[PDB]
Structures are given as structure tokens and as C-alpha cells.
Amino acid sequence: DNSYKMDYPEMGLCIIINNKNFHKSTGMTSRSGTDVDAANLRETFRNLKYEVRNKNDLTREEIVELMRDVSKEDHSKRSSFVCVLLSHGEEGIIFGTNGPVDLKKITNFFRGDRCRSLTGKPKLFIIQACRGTELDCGIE
Amino acid sequence: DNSYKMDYPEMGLCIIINNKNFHKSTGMTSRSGTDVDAANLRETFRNLKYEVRNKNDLTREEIVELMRDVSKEDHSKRSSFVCVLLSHGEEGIIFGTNGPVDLKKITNFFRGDRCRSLTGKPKLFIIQACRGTELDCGIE
Amino acid sequence: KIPVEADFLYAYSTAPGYYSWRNSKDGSWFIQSLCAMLKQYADKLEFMHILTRVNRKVATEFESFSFDATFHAKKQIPCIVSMLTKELYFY
Amino acid sequence: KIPVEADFLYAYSTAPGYYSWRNSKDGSWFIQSLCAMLKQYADKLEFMHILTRVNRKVATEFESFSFDATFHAKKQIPCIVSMLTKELYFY
Ligand SMILES: *C(=O)[C@H](CC(=O)O)NC(=O)c1cncc(-c2ccc(C(=O)O)cc2)c1
Ligand SMILES: *C(=O)[C@H](CC(=O)O)NC(=O)c1cncc(-c2ccc(C(=O)O)cc2)c1
């Protein structure tokens, strides 16, 4: 057996954190079109039998809390876990409407030792965010 | 075609930088076993038809200089490029016998715009180095 | 016993240190591409190969247009960070 | 036109922030597994899949042993960082 067991009762969760509007203090502009994403994703993962859940404009505190809570649920009947983040960011950092949070912190709630119901199961994290300011000119 | 073209005249280069002994000034210990790896790789890539070249105990300046030279070579008849690094190191860093060298620096020589003979060709970097001091305790 | 950091897959929209492009009416390049590929290959290709298609699409069919030379004619390449132990199929 | 960061593939022996294990007589766990998997599948599997086996083997079959309680019973997981545009086959 060299592929993940995907025949559990349910495919698993799909948390889509969609941050559009940021507090004046962050110095970030509204992310137009992000709703086209969150909508497009929702449908896509629904067709793959994932239980989808959308969240809009959550603060960095809310994001952490949400993760801590989802990682406390029992995933024994779930084949996998998918978490899509759409927001602003820098290298290793994503933005809550009111500020920055490093990925490490919200990812840790899911390691083999902290979230046992998902141990040995594929935990996917899709991230649409900037990782710095470098621009890629291209070639050819 | 969703697969890279590998039917060029030659598979390409396979540079193996193998640093075993470090300057007393760095305080790094000898990397026992590094030779077994170096030979293991040489054989493996030789069978895969690569033009293997080994190098040992290079300083940081030497590594940059070597990489700079390899990229100015013509790779038109080569299908890909492969560089293996065996040394000490931390996140985004690998050690020369005399000190650290940010990885970004040695890899930049090979991006699309800098090395046109390899544009559109697979540039593989295999790194056997520590990316920090953390130790994984395991689960289950 | 397995590593705690194992079985994680981080599919980034862009390479380390770089900017990530979003279209005001179509959504980000990465997300619209990721969803398109899933729609067509979720029942045929293993996940890593699907993200590779996403990678080619973003790098091939997208470029920025701006009146500001600074942000004009810019390119993007997604970044697959896998620590998966096995092959992944959605079927 | 394509991104200048495209077509690179970094195969890390370990995960971000972690230590990597080398065996005094058999060499590093990462490299010995990579070579082993290459010897067996370079003529049959796509490179990302080959690297995925390297991942399982290292995560599964290895574990440190030491008299020092701190260096004892540790694990390791390789880290594949792909920005490849196409599927890679050594044949
Ligand atoms: C950086 O964290 C974010 C990531 C995200 O997905 O939100 N990206 C942007 O802020 C971004 C993305 N796409 C386009 C633009 C932008 C806006 C205006 C111009 C212009 O030329 O006027 C160019 C690019 C910003
Ligand atoms: C960290 O930069 C390096 C990377 C490398 O490839 O050498 N790793 C080590 O230095 C390393 C890796 N595995 C084992 C050991 C080691 C050394 C001494 C003891 C001891 O008990 O004295 C245990 C393990 C070091």
C-alpha cells in the first residue's frame, strides 16, 4: 500500500478562511476578487465530497482559536483535512484582518502528536498570499 | 507533452559537493559517513547516465566560484542539471569548510535569466544538511 | 512511530520571497488554476501531478499588465512543499 | 515567457528548522534511501513519486539511538520543494 486510504466514511473538512477587508492599521488594501476564489473553491471541494465551511474576515486571534477548535474535533471517520487560507502575508506569515500570524503557529495544532485523529492522514494547506515583495520579470 | 524532454544528447551534469572537514575556526565536527554517501550518489547518477563530478572540502568562496563557472558552461546538449550538497548548515544556509553560504546565492546562478542553456530544463538540488536544531520526537 | 511533521502538504501560490497575483474579477491566478485542474484531473491524476499541471498553467498563461512599469509584465510560479508519505488520489 | 524561478526542484533531507541524521558507517538516512529508491524505480516511476517513497522509507524505517536522552529515539521527514512545470522521467 503506497497511497493514502481514502475510503473512510467521509473525505473530511475543508476550512476556507477568506480575508477580504483589513483594518486601517494593517496598511493593507481590500483583496478584490477573493470572493470569486472562496466561491470557486467551495464548489470544487464540495464535488469531492468534502464538508466545506467558509469564514470571512477573521482576526488573527479568531484564526488561531478556530484552528485550535477544529483540531480538537474527532477526525476518526475522516480521510483527510484541507485548510485554504486567502489573505495578505509575508514569508511564513499570513494576515488576520487585524494583523499578522506566522503559519507555524496555526499549523502546529495539526502535527501527529497534537491531533491524533489525523495522524497518518494527509493534512493539506493551500495558501494564496504574498511571501514577500520580489517581482518575477520572466524570460524567453 | 506534460513530461520534460529527456532525449537530448546527454542527461547533464551532476555536481556533488562533499564537505567532510571544516576549519577549526568554524567549530564544526567532521561529517563521518559523508564519503559513503558521496560514492553511493556517484554510482547512482552514473547509472542514470549523468556526467558526475565530485568535489571535496570546498570553502564558501570556492563553492560560489564553482557554481558560477558551471552555469557559464554551455548546456545546450544537456537535458538537465543536478547538484548535490553534503555539509553542515541551518535554514536557508549550507556550510563551506570555512563558513556559511546562503543557499539563495548559489542557486541564483541557475535561474531562467542567468543561465539560458538550462532555461526550460529541470534543475535539481539535493541537500543533505541540517535546517536548524530541532529534533522530531515522533508519534504512534 | 512516524515523524510529527509528516503527512503535511503546503501548496503555496508563489515562490519564497515573491509577490502573488490576484485578478480583480477572476480571482487569484493560483486559485482559479488550482480549481480548474481539480475539476478535470481529480479523478485521473495523483495529487502531486495535479499540482504540477497547476504549476505549468500559472507560469505559462499569466502575466501582469499595469500602467506602472514596476508592476508591469510580471510572472509567477507556484511552490509545492510536500512532506507526504504516500500517493494521494481523490477517488 | 516564463518565471525565472520555475523549473527548480529542491529535495531537502529534512523539514524546516530540523536536524538531519547521518550514520557513521552507512551514511545519511536521506541519501541512502534516495539512492536505494532510485536504483529500484528510476526506470518505472515519475520523480515526485520516487521522492515520495524516499519520504516514507525515511519516516518509517529510521530512528536514532543514543545514550544521550536528548539524541535518542528521534525521527526525520524529508521535504520536497517543487516548482517543476512538467513530469520528470529518467527514461
Ligand atoms: C500580497 O500579499 C497579495 C496576495 C493576495 O492574494 O492578496 N497580493 C496583492 O496585494 C496583489 C495581487 N494582485 C494584484 C495586485 C496589484 C494591484 C494593483 C496593481 C496595479 O498595477 O495597479 C498591480 C498589482 C496586488
Ligand atoms: C547538521 O548540520 C548535520 C548535517 C549532516 O549531514 O551532517 N548533522 C550532524 O551533525 C549529525 C547528524 N547525525 C548524527 C550526528 C550525531 C553526532 C554525534 C552524536 C553523538 O552521540 O555524539 C550523535 C549524532 C550529527
Total helices of chain A: the number is 3
Q: Any idea what the shape of chain A is?
A: globular
Report the C-alpha radius of gyration of chain C, rounded: 15 Å
DSSP strand tally of chain A:
7
How many helical elements of chain C? 2
- The count of DSSP E runs of length 2 or more, i.e. the number of strands of chain C, is 4
CATH architecture assignment of chain C: 2-Layer Sandwich
Organism (chains A, B): Homo sapiens (Human)
Active site (chains A, B): 88, 130
Protein name (chains A, B): Caspase-3 subunit p17
Modified residues (S-nitrosocysteine) (chains A, B): 130
Overview of this structure, please?
The complex is a heterotetramer, with two copies of chain A (140 residues) and two copies of chain C (91 residues). With 140 residues, chain A is α/β, with parallel strands linked by helices. Helix content of chain A is 21%, strand content 29%. In chain A, the strands form two sheets. In chain A, strands 2-1-3-7 form a four-stranded parallel β-sheet, covered by helices on one side. In chain A, strands 4-5-6 form a three-stranded antiparallel β-sheet. With 91 residues, chain C is an alpha+beta fold. A two-stranded antiparallel ribbon of chain C has the order 1-4. Chains A and C meet through helix 1 and strand 7 of A and strand 1, strand 2, strand 3 and helix 1 of C. One copy of the ligand *C(=O)[C@H](CC(=O)O)NC(=O)c1cncc(-c2ccc(C(=O)O)cc2)c1 sits between chains C (20-22, 28, 66, 68, 71) and A (31, 88-89, 128-130). It is classed as hydrolase. Keywords: cysteine protease, caspase-3, apopain, CPP32, yama, complex (protease-inhibitor), hydrolase.
Record the SSE blueprint:
The complex is a heterotetramer, with two copies of chain A (140 residues) and two copies of chain C (91 residues).
Chain A: E1 10-18, H1 34-47, E2 51-56, H2 60-70, E3 78-86, E4 89-90, E5 93-96, E6 99-102, H3 103-107, E7 123-128
Parallel strand pairs in A: 1-2, 1-3, 3-7
Antiparallel strand pairs in A: 4-5, 5-6
Chain C: E1 8-12, E2 22-23, E3 27-28, H1 29-41, H2 47-60, E4 79-82
Antiparallel strand pairs in C: 1-4, 2-3
Helix pairs in contact in C: 1-2
Bound molecules: the ligand *C(=O)[C@H](CC(=O)O)NC(=O)c1cncc(-c2ccc(C(=O)O)cc2)c1 (2 copies).
One copy of the ligand *C(=O)[C@H](CC(=O)O)NC(=O)c1cncc(-c2ccc(C(=O)O)cc2)c1 sits between chains C (20-22, 28, 66, 68, 71) and A (31, 88-89, 128-130).
